[PDB]
Amino acid sequence: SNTYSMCDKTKFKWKRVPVDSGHDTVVMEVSYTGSDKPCRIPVRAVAHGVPTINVAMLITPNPTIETSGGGFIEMQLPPGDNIIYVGDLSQQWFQKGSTIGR
């Protein structure tokens, strides 16, 4: 395998929780304690009621983990309550804006 392989989903830890710096994007940082670093981060997100569609509009098409991590990931999500998954990790994000309620 090459240096940038897929990082183990279960070896991720939260460094910085998802938050909008001020550019309508969700930024988070994740650390990785496994080997094969630097490596590519498995990232995905869903909305409430939408489990089968990856709603994660990923700004960075290739999230990566450096020597200790520092995996800065930006994604844009539909307004409402969304679920962001990094590896085996789960973290919900509430996005503000305009969306169809009912």
From Swiss-Prot:
Domain of life: Viruses
Function per UniProt: Binds to host cell surface receptor and mediates fusion between viral and cellular membranes. Envelope protein is synthesized in the endoplasmic reticulum in the form of heterodimer with protein prM. They play a role in virion budding in the ER, and the newly formed immature particle is covered with 60 spikes composed of heterodimer between precursor prM and envelope protein E. The virion is transported to the Golgi apparatus where the low pH causes dissociation of PrM-E heterodimers and formation of E homodimers. prM-E cleavage is inefficient, and many virions are only partially matured.
Subunit-level organization: Homodimer; in the endoplasmic reticulum and Golgi.
Subcellular location: Virion membrane; Host endoplasmic reticulum membrane
Post-translational modification comment from the UniProt entry: N-glycosylated.
Membrane topology value: Multi-pass membrane protein
Disulfide cysteine pairs (residue numbers): 7-39
Protein's recorded name: Envelope protein E
